[PDB]
Ligand binder design. Sequence first.
Ligand SMILES: CCCOc1ccc(C(=O)NS(=O)(=O)Cc2ccccc2)cc1CNC(=O)c1ccc(-c2ncccn2)cc1
Lengths: 261, 257
Amino acid sequence: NPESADLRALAKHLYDSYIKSFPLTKAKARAILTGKTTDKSPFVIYDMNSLMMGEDKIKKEVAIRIFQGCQFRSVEAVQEITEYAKSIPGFVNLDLNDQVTLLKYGVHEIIYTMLASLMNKDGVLISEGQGFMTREFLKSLRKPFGDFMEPKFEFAVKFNALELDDSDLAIFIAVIILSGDRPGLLNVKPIEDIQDNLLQALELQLKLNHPESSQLFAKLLQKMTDLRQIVTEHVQLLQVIKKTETDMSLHPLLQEIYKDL
Amino acid sequence: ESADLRALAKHLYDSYIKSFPLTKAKARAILTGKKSPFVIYDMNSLMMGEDKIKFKHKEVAIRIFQGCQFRSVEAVQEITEYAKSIPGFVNLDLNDQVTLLKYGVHEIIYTMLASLMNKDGVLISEGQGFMTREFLKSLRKPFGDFMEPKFEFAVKFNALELDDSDLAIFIAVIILSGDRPGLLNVKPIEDIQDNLLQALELQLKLNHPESSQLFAKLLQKMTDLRQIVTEHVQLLQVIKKTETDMSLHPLLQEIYK
Ligand SMILES: CCCOc1ccc(C(=O)NS(=O)(=O)Cc2ccccc2)cc1CNC(=O)c1ccc(-c2ncccn2)cc1
């Protein structure tokens, strides 16, 4: 029980850092998506003309502008994830090269994890929740942009079925970052010791927060397999773009992450 | 309620031993040294090997690859038999049983292959031989990196230091995956896996009380498994796209496709 007390304190710490690092929480996202309120209602984009009026309501080629907007949020997300990673007990103490490595392979798995919070079966929240882009509008985009988002939705609806809240995700995200199996890690053992502590925290957290959810801990860990696959599909799709879209500029920070990924 | 979980563990272990000849315990005793097997380290040792190994498994790199296919198909039947011993599996829809096996055998083959591997090589021909890791890397493209990704996984997987009692339940968990494409009734599959996951968790806590979060660390390996599988499929295509000297007997390729 004194051991469990330390785990709860770790859970509270991570959740607190989670709230402070990420602007759009899942709680706020679900409040917008369910449309229960009258002040948090998003403008919905489902075709070209709806997108046009969206430019005035929400603060080159259509498919390109959508992609460049996603690159912006992605880079901004890397900053937020990085800020959160620093708050993880023992992360900044690790070898400097391993810190870069853990973030390199970790950011996208987390991005797609938190992207699911902004997603349902019909679409995804955009621009801090001000807008809502339908799943069909994205799927109808010009090739190969019309299938860049579909694999994310498929994972989202299955991941959201686990019904995790932000207190759960906070620890799960930390578990992803501190992976000892990341390629190029100099000192793996100190990373595994931290993840071991994070896994204990996540286990107790899910058991207390979801007592009637049998093997939720196991089910959650298995979802990390789905994350890797989506990240893998994403990189391959990007290599197709850079050859067909030679005039489209990719962000240097992202390219450094994609480099030998 | 833990009486049922221990009963499941013992049941799966017994079927595991029966369905699979060369266990990890046997493979470990062979590798370490504790009746030594023939060692294949280069081209000449390979020739003398097949002259004395007596294998049912023209070019050297191709004959090795085809040899692996023969053993894989043998393993598929051993896995299939074991899968039918898992409580509730045979009661599932027949189409789902086929689906679970079709997408599950590859993950299981590479899981149990780690039991036959160390950092230096891999046991072949049910423990009769031993092909070094370096000789496998020396094979010309693209065969030179068809076994190497499996070694890298085996090193990380064997570090968990699981035994046959652990693996028996773990294999069952892999088979009962509810996310296999084309499944018609996912509920009873995930219900069985849920029970298997509980059995595995209790098994690892009792057999390895000093290994903290071993259960979680094992589930994370599922990621590496599927990575290897998809990577293996992509390599298979390269073999099919190029390579003329892969064409076997018309009736032979049917058996091992
Ligand atoms: C892609 C995977 C590689 O192939 C394999 C597939 C399954 C297994 C395996 O052991 N799976 S298993 O799950 O442990 C079940 C089993 C155990 C023992 C015998 C048969 C089945 C091992 C290998 C390992 N390779 C061999 O055993 C092997 C390799 C080369 C030759 C060979 N033969 C003649 C000439 C050259 N090479 C023969 C066997």
